[PDB]
Design a protein around this ligand. Structure first.
Ligand code: ADP
Ligand code: ADP
Ligand code: M3K
Ligand code: M3K
Ligand code: MG
Ligand code: MG
Lengths: 291, 291
């Protein structure tokens, strides 16, 4: 059935980035609890139907690695995208309370992301455009899912400004021009993994004294680092050699040299992670206390 | 009297940046129309009183070049700052409908800004930290006023992320580290003036063919320009030699070499503008249609 503004009821606020706030809501007619993202866009009515219209392909975005879509509509200056509520939140949140995420777990995470990106590529011909820990969502059934991918050309445009937060996951080629594409998602994924593995955003990399503890930076400074200095890497010793190479292949500067989804899929790390018997569901609650 | 949440009534939305929306509101008990800025901040209660407390010095910020302050309070996840409603909007808005702002007018603008920055310096020991066309506000009485200056240390911190919009007014030294201070406001002012004088954000500068018509860029690309390439400048011929030097002295890269408020105050351009008989009030409406 169609989703309409007054059919919803606010339960709590799930958080905010810039551009959007997201609420936990009850769809009164179905009883379903969902997550409603609201984007305040001061834009003409012609284009705002094109956005709604371009968001409808999300109805055909069915994968266990992609957040579910319920519907999209316009009301009171804001676009509403209504999604499956992920009760585990985003990996940036679980990182905060975890402190650090084990290699084992990041194994299962890496698989979801690669498979998610692959689904979007093959079935829908789109790149993500914003892979970072807060666009990777988890739940109590142990699912790991992507959202906030760039389905709508016109939405991408109307929101065009981006991310100055003292931290950026954009690939060097994306930071330097328009000559970029899907390979860029691999860079972002690689950098997210190193962050989650290490406990902190990994630039500048931990100086010798700072990696001891294992039991800010200005805008131009940070960007210059990304584009001009050698990429981040896992510390040796405490992570497996296969994981180290895996992230190493993700964080190669030259996007044509960088590994692509085809190659990461059949990587030793993924093959080793896929076999492993990991109770993610159990670990997720043990750390964030959902039960 | 004290300002409280339920004493207000929404009239219209004056716009949004990121971090805040600002509404045109009626303070029901006084009848006063004011502008209410709302900042959504997910922050502990101890610090949020420090913010309110640090915003109270705005009660002593009385200058004809500074937006008036009515009060500040916390309600429902958001800090509210209530200001004098400037019915002319911001100079970024008047630029859009003006197309271009005359030299004469920018004369009167430059004076307000310098005098505003000077007031904040001498009487309050603060730098602005965000001089750009949308933090310069005008009204039907012909007033030109600054707001959104950094009065509250703790607010500055809690909002710490900034400006990625394909356009930045931060000085080179501010983009490259923490070694910056009040001189940085001069850079921002100089760049705002060149924008308003020219009709478009002035980086990259107009190539020979593009300055003919007088009757985008990636993040790192833009920043690298600011810090590493020679600064923007007025085109010759269509602006006075005194204005040209004035902006030239504002946009010097080295912050110790850059002109300071003391020097711009007694600059030929300012002395020439101060004498001039300009009906700003009249021009403002002639262009935006307020009457
Ligand atoms: N479908 C969802 N289910 C549960 N939580 C969500 C969902 N979508 C978003 N969130 C939460 O909302 C927060 C803010 O989302 P968003 O507006 O996209 O900002 P950002 O991703 O930049 O933090 C996310 O960090 C996440 O915690
Ligand atoms: N006191 C005010 N009176 C009238 N309009 C205002 C006032 N303060 C802000 N505005 C309007 O609100 C808009 C958005 O303000 P803000 O949240 O500071 O975002 P930004 O300054 O980044 O555009 C401004 O561009 C201006 O048009
Ligand atoms: N940011 C979004 O939420 C977003 C978006 N949202 C979105 C997509 C799928 C699902 I399931 C849930 C969602 F909410 C859909 C778009 F088509 C473009 C978007 O954002 C575009 C800007 C980014 O590229 C960089 O910030
Ligand atoms: N942005 C603000 O609105 C803001 C602020 N607001 C503010 C100040 C004076 C008046 I009269 C009206 C106002 F609304 C007061 C502060 F103390 C810090 C601020 O912002 C800090 C961030 C900026 O430095 C960079 O974005
Ligand atoms: Mg998100
Ligand atoms: Mg402002």
């Amino acid at each position: 059935m169609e989703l309409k503004d007054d059919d919803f009821e606010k339960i709590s606020e799930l958080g905010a980035g810039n551009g959007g706030v997201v609420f936990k809501v009850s769809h009164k007619p179905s009883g379903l609890v969902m997550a409603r993202k609201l984007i305040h866009l001061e834009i003409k009515p012609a284009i705002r139907n094109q956005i709604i219209r371009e968001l409808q392909v999300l109805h055909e975005c069915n994968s266990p690695y992609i957040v579910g879509f319920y519907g999209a509509f316009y009301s009171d200056g804001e676009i509403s995208i209504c999604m499956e509520h992920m009760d585990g939140g985003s990996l940036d949140q679980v990182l905060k309370k975890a402190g650090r995420i084990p290699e084992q777990i990041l194994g299962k995470v890496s698989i979801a992301v690669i498979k998610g990106l692959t689904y979007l590529r093959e079935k829908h011909k789109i790149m993500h455009r914003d892979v970072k820990p807060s666009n990777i969502l988890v739940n109590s059934r142990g699912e790991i899912k992507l959202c906030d991918f760039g389905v709508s050309g016109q939405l991408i445009d109307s929101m065009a400004n981006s991310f100055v937060g003292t931290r950026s996951y954009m690939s060097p080629e994306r930071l330097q021009g328009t000559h970029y594409s899907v390979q860029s998602d691999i860079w972002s994924m690689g950098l997210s993994l190193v962050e989650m593995a290490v406990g902190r955003y990994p630039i500048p990399p931990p100086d010798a004294k700072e990696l001891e503890l294992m039991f800010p930076m200005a805008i131009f400074e940070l960007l210059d680092y990304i584009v001009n200095e050698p990429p981040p890497k896992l510390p040796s010793g405490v992570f497996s050699l296969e994981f180290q190479d895996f992230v190493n292949k993700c964080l190669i500067k030259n996007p044509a040299e960088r590994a692509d989804l085809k190659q990461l899929m059949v990587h030793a790390f993924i093959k080793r992670s896929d076999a492993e018997e990991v109770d993610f569901a159990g670990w997720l609650c043990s750390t964030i206390g959902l039960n």
